[PDB]
């Protein structure tokens, strides 16, 4: 998955390092690879990565680089 999410341009997308995405995975506006493209649109709103309730609770402000 490290090389997968990375091959789909998530590593530092809108100021969010790969570790944040790999951790988020662990714990029609999009009009629908498909999951990543939609997440990119979701993170662009006023919430950021906090749109994923689990990311705030378990990944936001931890050693996220440990996931990669």
């Amino acid at each position, epitope marked *: 998955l490290a090389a997968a999410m990375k091959r789909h341009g998530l590593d530092n997308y809108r100021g969010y390092s790969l570790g944040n995405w790999v951790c988020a995975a662990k714990f029609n506006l999009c009009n629908i690879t498909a999951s990543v493209n939609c997440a990119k649109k979701i993170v662009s709103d006023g919430n950021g990565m906090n749109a994923w309730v689990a990311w*705030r*609770n378990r990944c*936001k*402000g931890t050693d996220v680089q440990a996931w990669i």
Partner: antibody
Amino acid sequence: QVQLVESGGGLVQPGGSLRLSCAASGFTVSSNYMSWVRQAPGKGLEWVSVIYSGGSTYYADSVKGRFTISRDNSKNTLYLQMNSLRAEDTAVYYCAREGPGDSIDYWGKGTLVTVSS
Amino acid sequence: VLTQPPSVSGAPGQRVSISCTGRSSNIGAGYDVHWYQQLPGKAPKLLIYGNTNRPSGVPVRFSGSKSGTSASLAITGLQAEDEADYYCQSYDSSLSGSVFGGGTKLTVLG
């Protein structure tokens, strides 16, 4: 060893501007979530703004358009630019470092900002 | 906003729980709740974090719990040294940032 020392507090006139500095040590601000939380005399706590490790910035609706959070990665300093200041903004402004899930982990000693004529 | 009772007046040795009533936008969504203790003339200190965990140095008697749309902080064997202002904190999503409760003035009877 983790120290958060804020400065820049004092008297400002209504509609005036002020900038707060937070000199950090014992850790790096470029690798951490950094926030400002205020407290008006004898009142509750209020989240002002946050700066993410990757540069993302968020603000409370009460300060949006007037305040700006920023940092100096080289100087290891956190800033808060405050414009168009009202008497409502009179508060002790604490520099904060976030732990897990935007919880506050370390607080500064606080700096009091007074808005009056 | 998160809501807490202005007070709570409790007895020494007796257990107490402080309520943090949320909304669908904060606790209802499933965002973890953190608790702070604030002594007079001092800055707040992280007591409980999301929503049960304790940081290094907080006594085992301080506990946290989350019930769907709300949360509570419990103190087993209350001491006079617990007379402080207590705050709950979560993330509001319509507001797009951290949100704090009104605060609770803990009183030790006796």
